[PDB]
Write a protein that holds these residues in place. Structure first.
Motif, mmCIF file in Angstrom:
data_model
loop_
_atom_site.group_PDB
_atom_site.id
_atom_site.type_symbol
_atom_site.label_atom_id
_atom_site.label_comp_id
_atom_site.label_asym_id
_atom_site.label_seq_id
_atom_site.Cartn_x
_atom_site.Cartn_y
_atom_site.Cartn_z
ATOM 1 N N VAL A 1 1.247 -23.001 14.954
ATOM 2 C CA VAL A 1 0.371 -23.213 16.118
ATOM 3 C C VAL A 1 -0.386 -24.648 16.331
ATOM 4 C CG1 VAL A 1 -1.248 -21.522 17.541
ATOM 5 C CG2 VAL A 1 -0.696 -21.190 15.155
ATOM 6 N N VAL A 2 -0.455 -25.219 17.525
ATOM 7 C CA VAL A 2 -1.069 -26.438 17.675
ATOM 8 C C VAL A 2 -2.091 -26.466 18.698
ATOM 9 C CG1 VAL A 2 -0.326 -28.852 17.994
ATOM 10 C CG2 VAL A 2 1.315 -26.907 17.551
ATOM 11 N N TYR A 3 -3.111 -27.033 18.496
ATOM 12 C CA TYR A 3 -4.415 -27.344 19.376
ATOM 13 C C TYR A 3 -4.238 -28.477 20.202
ATOM 14 C CZ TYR A 3 -6.673 -23.769 16.490
ATOM 15 O OH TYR A 3 -7.054 -22.688 15.792
ATOM 16 N N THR A 4 -5.133 -28.476 21.081
ATOM 17 C CA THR A 4 -5.159 -29.546 22.298
ATOM 18 C C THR A 4 -5.794 -30.979 21.704
ATOM 19 O OG1 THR A 4 -7.094 -28.953 23.021
ATOM 20 C CG2 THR A 4 -5.448 -27.938 24.111
ATOM 21 N N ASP A 5 -6.042 -31.855 22.689
ATOM 22 C CA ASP A 5 -6.769 -33.204 21.924
ATOM 23 C C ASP A 5 -8.067 -33.256 22.157
ATOM 24 O OD1 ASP A 5 -4.006 -34.207 22.246
ATOM 25 O OD2 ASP A 5 -4.421 -33.817 24.261
ATOM 26 N N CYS A 6 -8.762 -33.995 21.687
ATOM 27 C CA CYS A 6 -10.229 -34.004 21.691
ATOM 28 C C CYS A 6 -10.819 -35.090 22.920
ATOM 29 C CB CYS A 6 -11.045 -34.656 20.481
ATOM 30 S SG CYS A 6 -11.372 -33.470 19.295
ATOM 31 N N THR A 7 -11.983 -34.708 23.364
ATOM 32 C CA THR A 7 -12.452 -35.411 24.345
ATOM 33 C C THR A 7 -13.838 -36.054 24.002
ATOM 34 O OG1 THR A 7 -13.942 -34.618 25.972
ATOM 35 C CG2 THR A 7 -12.137 -33.259 25.288
ATOM 36 N N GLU A 8 -14.671 -35.650 23.147
ATOM 37 C CA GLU A 8 -16.006 -35.926 22.674
ATOM 38 C C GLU A 8 -16.045 -35.890 21.148
ATOM 39 O OE1 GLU A 8 -19.010 -33.438 24.617
ATOM 40 O OE2 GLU A 8 -19.110 -35.172 25.809
ATOM 41 N N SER A 9 -16.952 -36.432 20.748
ATOM 42 C CA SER A 9 -17.320 -36.493 19.180
ATOM 43 C C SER A 9 -18.056 -35.431 18.779
ATOM 44 C CB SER A 9 -18.000 -37.603 18.901
ATOM 45 O OG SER A 9 -18.206 -38.533 20.063
ATOM 46 N N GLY A 10 -17.669 -34.791 17.491
ATOM 47 C CA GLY A 10 -18.225 -33.643 16.813
ATOM 48 C C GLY A 10 -17.318 -32.360 17.072
ATOM 49 N N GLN A 11 -16.096 -32.400 17.921
ATOM 50 C CA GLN A 11 -15.292 -31.455 18.118
ATOM 51 C C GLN A 11 -14.738 -30.875 16.679
ATOM 52 O OE1 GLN A 11 -16.199 -30.902 21.436
ATOM 53 N NE2 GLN A 11 -14.669 -32.370 22.230
ATOM 54 N N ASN A 12 -13.808 -30.241 16.720
ATOM 55 C CA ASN A 12 -13.144 -29.709 15.134
ATOM 56 C C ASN A 12 -11.533 -29.259 15.630
ATOM 57 O OD1 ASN A 12 -15.038 -30.180 13.493
ATOM 58 N ND2 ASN A 12 -14.889 -28.028 12.529
ATOM 59 N N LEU A 13 -11.451 -28.276 16.289
ATOM 60 C CA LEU A 13 -10.033 -27.871 16.250
ATOM 61 C C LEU A 13 -9.485 -28.663 17.479
ATOM 62 C CD1 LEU A 13 -10.086 -23.932 16.029
ATOM 63 C CD2 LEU A 13 -9.341 -25.767 14.061
ATOM 64 N N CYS A 14 -8.828 -29.947 17.309
ATOM 65 C CA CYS A 14 -8.110 -30.642 18.102
ATOM 66 C C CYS A 14 -7.169 -31.711 17.546
ATOM 67 C CB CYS A 14 -9.174 -31.503 18.818
ATOM 68 S SG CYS A 14 -9.814 -33.150 18.238
ATOM 69 N N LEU A 15 -7.129 -32.734 18.165
ATOM 70 C CA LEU A 15 -6.129 -33.880 17.311
ATOM 71 C C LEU A 15 -6.919 -35.052 17.562
ATOM 72 C CD1 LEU A 15 -3.380 -32.970 19.796
ATOM 73 C CD2 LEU A 15 -3.392 -32.405 17.385
ATOM 74 N N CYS A 16 -7.446 -35.612 16.212
ATOM 75 C CA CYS A 16 -8.284 -36.939 16.123
ATOM 76 C C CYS A 16 -7.367 -37.899 15.690
ATOM 77 C CB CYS A 16 -9.458 -36.745 15.210
ATOM 78 S SG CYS A 16 -10.331 -35.134 15.139
ATOM 79 N N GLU A 17 -6.661 -37.743 14.398
ATOM 80 C CA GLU A 17 -5.854 -38.690 13.967
ATOM 81 C C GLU A 17 -4.481 -38.536 14.595
ATOM 82 O OE1 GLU A 17 -5.862 -40.754 10.637
ATOM 83 O OE2 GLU A 17 -7.012 -39.532 9.198
ATOM 84 N N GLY A 18 -4.244 -39.495 15.559
ATOM 85 C CA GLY A 18 -3.034 -39.524 16.062
ATOM 86 C C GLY A 18 -2.444 -37.830 16.675
ATOM 87 N N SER A 19 -1.778 -37.281 15.936
ATOM 88 C CA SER A 19 -1.385 -35.717 16.394
ATOM 89 C C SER A 19 -1.822 -34.873 15.246
ATOM 90 C CB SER A 19 0.043 -36.076 16.681
ATOM 91 O OG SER A 19 0.760 -35.219 15.602
#
Length: 49
Positions: A1-19
């Motif tokens: 399973v893969v999550y979506t990308d982030c848009t704000e700071s503090g999120q968690n289940l997303c993509l912070c480092e590249g992918s």
């Protein structure tokens, strides 16, 4: 399973480092000082939709 990308700071289940997924068990911060995102341990909320 893969999550979506982030848009704000503090999120968690997303993509912070590249992918790579950085969330549960840690905290993610977006562009610090004009820089990119970083996965720092802490308490963050998943990424809603």
């Amino acid at each position: 399973v893969v999550y979506t990308d982030c848009t704000e700071s503090g999120q968690n289940l997303c993509l912070c480092e590249g992918s790579n997924v950085c969330g549960q068990g840690n905290k993610c911060i977006l562009g610090s000082d004009g820089e990119k995102n970083q996965c720092v341990t802490g308490e963050g909320t998943p990424e809603p939709q």
